[PDB]
Amino acid sequence: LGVYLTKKEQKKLRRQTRREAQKELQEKVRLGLMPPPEPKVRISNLMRVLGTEAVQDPTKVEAHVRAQMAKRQKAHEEANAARKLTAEQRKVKKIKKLKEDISQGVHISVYRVRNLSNPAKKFKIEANAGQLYLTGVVVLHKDVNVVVVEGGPKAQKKFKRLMLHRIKNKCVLVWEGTAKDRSFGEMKFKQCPTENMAREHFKKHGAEHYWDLALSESVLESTD
Amino acid sequence: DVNPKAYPLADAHLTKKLLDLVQQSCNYKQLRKGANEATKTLNRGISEFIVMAADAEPLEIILHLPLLCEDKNVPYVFVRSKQALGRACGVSRPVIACSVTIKEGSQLKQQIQSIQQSIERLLV
Amino acid sequence: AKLWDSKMFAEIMMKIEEYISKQAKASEVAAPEYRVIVDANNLTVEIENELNIIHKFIRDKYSKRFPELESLVPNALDYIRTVKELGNSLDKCKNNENLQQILTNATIMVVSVTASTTQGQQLSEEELERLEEACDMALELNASKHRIYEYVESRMSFIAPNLSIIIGASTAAKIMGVAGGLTNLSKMPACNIMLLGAQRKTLSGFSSTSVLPHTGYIYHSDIVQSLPPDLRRKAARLVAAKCTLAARVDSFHESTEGKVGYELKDEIERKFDKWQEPPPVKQVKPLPAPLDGQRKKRGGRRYRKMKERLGLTEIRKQANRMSFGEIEEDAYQEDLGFSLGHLGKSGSGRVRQTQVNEATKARISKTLQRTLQKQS
Amino acid sequence: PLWLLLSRLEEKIGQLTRARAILEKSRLKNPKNPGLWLESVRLEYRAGLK
Amino acid sequence: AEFERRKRARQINVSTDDSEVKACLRALGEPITLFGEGPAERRERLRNILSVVNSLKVARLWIANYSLPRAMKRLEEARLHKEIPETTRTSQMQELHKSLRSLNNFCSQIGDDRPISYCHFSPNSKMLATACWSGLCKLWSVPDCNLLHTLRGHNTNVGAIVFHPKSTVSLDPKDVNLASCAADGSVKLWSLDSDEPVADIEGHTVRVARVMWHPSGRFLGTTCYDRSWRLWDLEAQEEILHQEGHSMGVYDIAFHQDGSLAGTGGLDAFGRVWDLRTGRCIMFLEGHLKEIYGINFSPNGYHIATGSGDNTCKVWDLRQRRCVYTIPAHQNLVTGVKFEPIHGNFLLTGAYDNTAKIWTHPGWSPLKTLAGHEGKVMGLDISSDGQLIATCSYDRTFKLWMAE
RNA sequence: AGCUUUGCGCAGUGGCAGUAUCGUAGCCAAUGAGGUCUAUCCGAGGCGCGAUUAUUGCUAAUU
C-alpha cells in the first residue's frame, strides 16, 4: 500500500535535504566545530587560486594541488567501496529475489517434447530448473517426454520462455496451472522405456494425470 | 464499501502490482492519464489495458470505458483508490482512469502481458 | 443511379418516422418513447449522410458553371442556397438578393468578385433542372432535420436531463444530433465534444483569430457566450468537459432528477465567477533608499564572464579615441557627429585592424530559445 | 480461398449463422490471417451488425 | 549544544494534521494556540517541545419423500446396467466416443452486443436461454439459431438463467419457466409468453452468482456473495434455508438428480455437499486452490466434478467420500463443468481459455477439444437429448455442436 | 554466472548558461492545466503573490 511520489515531489525532497545539509555545515563552520572549507583547486585552477605561491614554488604548489585532488578521489572511492555489496551478499540478494513464496500456492506447468536425446538440452533443463527452484521430473519415452515443472510464477514464465524460444520434433505446453502443494523434488530425468512404470512413477508423487494428458495428446497428434 | 457497479475490482496484491506497472509505464513514457485520454487511446487501439478508480463520484463518468474496452477487446480493471492511482501515474491530483499504451520493443511487454492475463481472469 | 434511387427510399423512411414522431408528440401532450428518440437520432445521422452526398453531387455538377464557389463557401447548406440563388446566371442581380441572409457581406463581395472572372461555361437545361431538383431535395431534407431537432429538443428533459441543465436543450439537441446519439456522445473525449459543430470557415483577407477557429456549438452556447471574449476559450473548454461528464452520466440514465447536472452547473458558475473576480489589492513598492555603505560582491567564474562581457573591448577602446586636429570625413548621413574614432584611421598606432571579440556576440534569451525550439 | 468461397455460399444459402461458424473455424485453422478476418468483418457488416 | 538539539528536532516526525497537533500539545499541557500562532507555527512549537523532551421441516420431509424413491430407482438402474453384458457397454462406449470426436461448430449466433454470461438448454432440448451482461435474457430455438422470445431482463449484468425442469414439457408457458440472477442480487422469474418478469424474488442484498432449480421443480437454489446460499420454495413463496457454511462468497450450486443432496461451490476454494433432507454438511470438498467456479453432480449419483482457478477439474467420489481424479483441464480459469445429462457418458469443461474440452466420465481422458470462439467461455450446457452442446462466451456469441 | 533497461539516491569528473533561480497553511488543475500551426486533433502544470547581486554562501583585500 505504498504511495508513489511525483517528480516535483522528489525534486522538493532532494532540494530541501541538500539545503538542510548545507545549512548544518555552515552552522558547524561558523560555530567553530568545523574548519572553513579550503578552495577547490585543479590543474586548470592552479594559477587562478595560487599564482603568487605557484611562482615561488612551482613543484611544491603542483604537489599540493595534486594531493588535494587525490584526496578528493580517494574519498570518493572510499565512499563507493565502503558501501559495496559483498560478493557473498550479492548472491544472498540474488538467491532471495529468485525464491518466490510458494506458501500461498505453487504454479505447475507440464510440457511434452517429441525428442530429448541431446545431453546438452538435458543439462540446460536441469540447470535452469535448479537455479529457478523449479522442482519437478523429466520422464523419457520414445515420443512422450513429460516435463513437470513446479515453482514460482516468475520462474515458470522464464522456463516456459526458455523452451519456447531459447531451446528448440517440437516442444508443446501440455498444461499450466496451480496446485496447493508441491509434489516433486529436484530434476532427476528418469528414463522410462515403457508406459506402465512411467505411470506408476507419476502415481508415486500423485500426479499421474499429467502423464495421462501427455500420453493422450501424443496419441491424438500421432493419429492426426 | 465500493460501488458494486465496479465488478472487476482488484484485490490488494493485484492493486499493488497494477500501481507498480502504472508507475513503470509512466517512467517509460507509455501511460496516458485521465478518462478522456483513455477514451482516445481506446478509439485508436493503442491501449494495452485500462485502469480506472472505484471512488469516482459519480462512477458513471467512467463506466463508458468498460464498454469501449469490450468493443476494442482491451482488458480493464477497477482499483479501490483514485488518489493512489493518481500517485502511481506521477500526478498529485487524483486520476480516475489511466491507459497503458502500446510501444513496440518496450521492456514492459512481459509485465503488461502478465497483468493482462491476471486481469482477464478476475472479472468473473 | 444509386444516390437518386436511394433518395426516394430515404424520403419515404423519413416521412414514416416523422409521422411516428408527430404521433408521439401528440400523445405525450408497447412502443415506448425512448425507441422513438433513438429512431429520430438515427434519422439525424441518415439525413446528414444523405445531405453530404447531395452536396457533393451538386458541387460536382455546379463546378462546370462556377468552379471556385466551393472554396469561397465551404458550408454545405450555404453552398446549396448560394448555387440555388445564383443558378446559371451569375450576374443576375442576385448579389443584393437573399445572399445577404445566406452569406456574410465580406464573402458576398468575395464571391461576386470571383464570379466577375469565372471562366466557366453555362450549364445545359437538363443540368439546370437536375441542379434545382437536388437543391430542393436538400432543402426539404434540411427542413426535416430541423423538425427532428425541434422534436428532440422538446424531449431533452428526459433523455439527457443532466446535460440539459448545463447548456440548455437547444445546444443539447445540436450536439446530440451531430454526435450521432447520446451513446456516441458519451463514448467521446471532451476535446472532441468541444469541437462538435465546428466549421472550417474561410478567412477572407483576415487573421485566423478574427474568424473564430476550433469553435463549435458549445462555444456559441448561451453560458459560454455570456463571458467576455478573452475568457470564452477557457469557458468553452470547461463547459465541454462538464457536458461530457453529464453525457456520460446521462447515457446510463442516472441522476434523472438532474442533481449531477445542477452540481456541474454550480461548479461552472463558481469557476466563471472566479474568472470574473476583481483583482486583489496589491501593495505599492516604494523606491529603495539611497545607500552609500560598502557592499562586498563575490567573484569567480560568473563574475569573470560578466566582466568579460561588460568590459571595455579593444574595438570599443579604439572607437572612443578621437585624434586631435585630424578632421575626419562624415561617414553616416543619417546621424552626424557619429564617427569610428581611431578605427581604421591614421594615428591609431596599430598596423593591423582589431579583431571582433566573440564574447560580445549577440545571443538570445533562454526562454526565447525555448520558444524558438518549440516553434520548430 | 476455399474457406471464404464456402462461407460466401453459406451467406447466399440464407443460413448466415452457418457462415459465421465456418468463418470462425477457418480463422481457428488459419490464425492471424487478414484474408479470413476481412471476410469475417464484411459478413457482419453486410448483415447489418455494424 | 543547542545546534545538536536543532538537529534532533529535524529528525523528529510530527503529525501534519492540525487537530492531531492540537491534541498532542494539549496532552503535554502547553497552550494550544499562542497569539498569532497559525497551524505551521503550532507545528513548529510542537517540534521544538518534542526536541526539548416449521416450513423447513416440512420442506425437508417433502424432499426426502421425493428423493428416496428416485435414489432407489437409480440404484436398481445401475444394477441392471451391471447385468448388461460388458460387450454391449463397451460397444456403446466407443460409439459415444466416436460420436463425440466428430463434433463440429454447428452454428454461431450473436446473442447480444455484450458478453453472454450463461446458456441453458430447455428440458425439451428445443429452446436455449442465454444470459447477457446487457441486462437482457433471450430465448433461442435450438435446431435453428433465431430469437423467438426476448426478455426485458434485469438492470445489471445477468449471471445465470436456468429453465424450470418441467418447463416446455408439462407446465403451461404462462407459468414460471425461468429464473435469472443479476449482478445486483435480484432474482426474477419468467414465463415463455411474457417478456416482463412474472415475479421478483428479493432478500439478496448482495450479488448472487448462480440460480438453479431443484430437480423436483419446487425449490430454487440461490447462492449469494454473503458467504451464504439460499433455497427458495415456489409453493411457499418464501426462502427456506439461508445456510452459512462458506468462509467466502458462494459462487455455484449443483443439485442431485435424485434430489437428496445439494453441492455448493464458492470462492472459499472448498466445496460442501449439504443434505437437503437434514440440513447438515455430509461431505466437505477439499483440495482445490483458489475459488471454485463450477460444480455439477453427475447423473450416476456418486460422482461430483468441480472446476476452479487451478486450471483443474477435480472429480469427487461420494461413495469413497474423497477425490478420485484431478483433471488438469484448460490453461485458464475453468468456469463451466457439466456431465452428460442422461448418464455418465462424458464430462464437458469450459474455461477462460476460449475453448471447451470433452472427457470420458469414467476414464477422465480427453476426446475432443471444442476449439473455437474468440473470448472467454463463461458457461455451457448439454441438452437432455445429449447430442446438443451450447457454449456462450465473452465473444458475444453462442455456438452449437452436433456430431457430423 | 555475467550482461543490460528504467527510476531513485550518493558522490566524482567535465561542459553550458546567470533576462533567471527558488518560495506557495494563495488559487485552479488528468472529474483536464494550456492550446499561433495538426482541432472529432494536442495533454501538464498554470496563475497570483513574495525573495534576489536575475539562487545563496563563505574567503581574501581595501576599511
Curated annotation (Swiss-Prot), chain A:
Localization recorded for this chain is: Nucleus; Nucleus speckle
Q: Where are the transmembrane segments?
A: none
Instruction: Reproduce the UniProt comment on modification after translation.
Output: Ubiquitinated. Undergoes 'Lys-63'-linked polyubiquitination by PRPF19 and deubiquitination by USP4. 'Lys-63'-linked ubiquitination increases the affinity for PRPF8 and may regulate the assembly of the U4/U6-U5 tri-snRNP complex.
Subcellular location, principal: nucleus
Its BP terms in the Gene Ontology are:
mRNA processing; mRNA splicing, via spliceosome; RNA splicing; RNA splicing, via transesterification reactions; spliceosomal tri-snRNP complex assembly
Where does the record place a coiled coil? Answer: none
Tissues expressing the protein = Highly expressed in retina, liver, kidney and blood. Detected at lower levels in heart and brain.
Q: Which GO terms describe its molecular function?
A: identical protein binding; RNA binding
Show the segment(s) annotated as Mediates interaction with SART3. 1-115
An annotated GO cellular component: U4/U6 x U5 tri-snRNP complex
Provide this UniProt record's keywords sorted from A to Z: Disease variant, Isopeptide bond, mRNA processing, mRNA splicing, Nucleus, Phosphoprotein, Retinitis pigmentosa, Spliceosome, Ubl conjugation
Would you say which domain of life the source belongs to?
Eukaryota
Q: Which disease is it linked to?
A: Retinitis pigmentosa 18: A retinal dystrophy belonging to the group of pigmentary retinopathies. Retinitis pigmentosa is characterized by retinal pigment deposits visible on fundus examination and primary loss of rod photoreceptor cells followed by secondary loss of cone photoreceptors. Patients typically have night vision blindness and loss of midperipheral visual field. As their condition progresses, they lose their far peripheral visual field and eventually central vision as well.
Which species is this record about? Homo sapiens
Q: Which gene encodes it?
A: PRPF3
Swiss-Prot record, chain C:
Region annotation (Disordered) maps to 278-301
Site entry (Interaction with U4 snRNA), positions: C191
In the record, Phosphoserine modifications are located at S323, S339, S376
| Record's comment on post-translational modification | Phosphorylated by PRP4K during spliceosome assembly.
Coiled-coil-forming residues are 30-64, 125-159
Instruction: Please give the Gene Ontology molecular function terms for this protein.
Output: identical protein binding; protein-macromolecule adaptor activity; ribonucleoprotein complex binding; RNA binding; snRNP binding; U4 snRNA binding; U4atac snRNA binding
State any GO CC term. Answer: U2-type precatalytic spliceosome
Q: Name the residue ranges of motif: Nuclear localization signal (NLS).
A: 295-308
**One BP term from GO:** spliceosomal tri-snRNP complex assembly
Give residue ranges for domain Nop: 159-277
Disulphide bridges: none
Q: Where is this site: Interaction with U4 snRNA and U4atac snRNA?
A: H214, R237, K242
Where located? Answer: Nucleus; Nucleus speckle; Nucleus, Cajal body
Give the UniProt tissue specificity note: Ubiquitously expressed.
Q: Where is this site: Interaction with U4atac snRNA?
A: R233
Keywords assigned: Acetylation, Coiled coil, Disease variant, Isopeptide bond, mRNA processing, mRNA splicing, Nucleus, Phosphoprotein, Retinitis pigmentosa, Ribonucleoprotein, RNA-binding, Spliceosome, Ubl conjugation
Q: How does it assemble?
A: Identified in the spliceosome B complex. Component of the U4/U6-U5 tri-snRNP complex composed of the U4, U6 and U5 snRNAs and at least PRPF3, PRPF4, PRPF6, PRPF8, PRPF31, SNRNP200, TXNL4A, SNRNP40, DDX23, CD2BP2, PPIH, SNU13, EFTUD2, SART1 and USP39. Interacts with a complex formed by SNU13 and U4 snRNA, but not with SNU13 or U4 snRNA alone. The complex formed by SNU13 and PRPF31 also binds U4atac snRNA, a characteristic component of specific, less abundant spliceosomal complexes. Interacts with PRPF6/U5 snRNP-associated 102 kDa protein.
- Which family is this protein grouped under? Belongs to the PRP31 family.
* Gene name of this polypeptide: PRPF31
> Parent protein range shown?
52 to 432 of 499
Curated annotation (Swiss-Prot), chain D:
- Its domain of life reads Eukaryota
Where in or outside the cell? Nucleus, Nucleoplasm; Nucleus speckle
Q: In which tissues is it expressed?
A: Widely expressed.
Please list the disulfide bridges: none
Q: What does UniProt say on post-translational modification here?
A: Phosphorylated by PRP4K during spliceosome assembly.
The job of this chain, per UniProt, is described as: Involved in pre-mRNA splicing as component of the U4/U6-U5 tri-snRNP complex, one of the building blocks of the spliceosome. Enhances dihydrotestosterone-induced transactivation activity of AR, as well as dexamethasone-induced transactivation activity of NR3C1, but does not affect estrogen-induced transactivation.
Q: How does it assemble?
A: Identified in the spliceosome B complex. Identified in the spliceosome C complex. Associates with the U5 snRNP particle. Component of the U4/U6-U5 tri-snRNP complex composed of the U4, U6 and U5 snRNAs and at least PRPF3, PRPF4, PRPF6, PRPF8, PRPF31, SNRNP200, TXNL4A, SNRNP40, DDX23, CD2BP2, PPIH, SNU13, EFTUD2, SART1 and USP39, LSm proteins LSm2-8 and Sm proteins. Interacts with ARAF. Interacts with AR and NR3C1, but not ESR1, independently of the presence of hormones. Interacts with USH1G.
Put simply, this protein is called: Pre-mRNA-processing factor 6
Organism, by scientific name, is Homo sapiens (Human)
UniProtKB/Swiss-Prot annotation, chain E:
Q: Which GO terms describe its cellular component?
A: Cajal body; nuclear speck; nucleoplasm; nucleus; spliceosomal complex; spliceosomal snRNP complex; U2-type precatalytic spliceosome; U4/U6 snRNP
Is Nucleus among this UniProt entry's keywords? yes
GO biological process: one example: RNA splicing, via transesterification reactions
Asked whether the keyword ATP-binding is assigned, the reply is: no
> Which keywords does the record carry?
Acetylation, Disease variant, mRNA processing, mRNA splicing, Nucleus, Repeat, Retinitis pigmentosa, Spliceosome, WD repeat
Intracellular or extracellular location(s): Nucleus; Nucleus speckle
> Which sections of the protein are WD repeats?
111-150, 153-200, 203-242, 245-284, 287-326, 329-369, 372-403
GO function terms (MF aspect): U4 snRNA binding; U6 snRNA binding
Record: disease: Retinitis pigmentosa 70: A retinal dystrophy belonging to the group of pigmentary retinopathies. Retinitis pigmentosa is characterized by retinal pigment deposits visible on fundus examination and primary loss of rod photoreceptor cells followed by secondary loss of cone photoreceptors. Patients typically have night vision blindness and loss of midperipheral visual field. As their condition progresses, they lose their far peripheral visual field and eventually central vision as well.
Q: What does this protein do?
A: Plays a role in pre-mRNA splicing as component of the U4/U6-U5 tri-snRNP complex that is involved in spliceosome assembly, and as component of the precatalytic spliceosome (spliceosome B complex).
Give the protein's recorded name. Answer: U4/U6 small nuclear ribonucleoprotein Prp4
Native source species? Homo sapiens (Human)
Gene symbol of the encoding locus? PRPF4
Q: Which residues of the full protein are shown?
A: 88 to 522 of 522
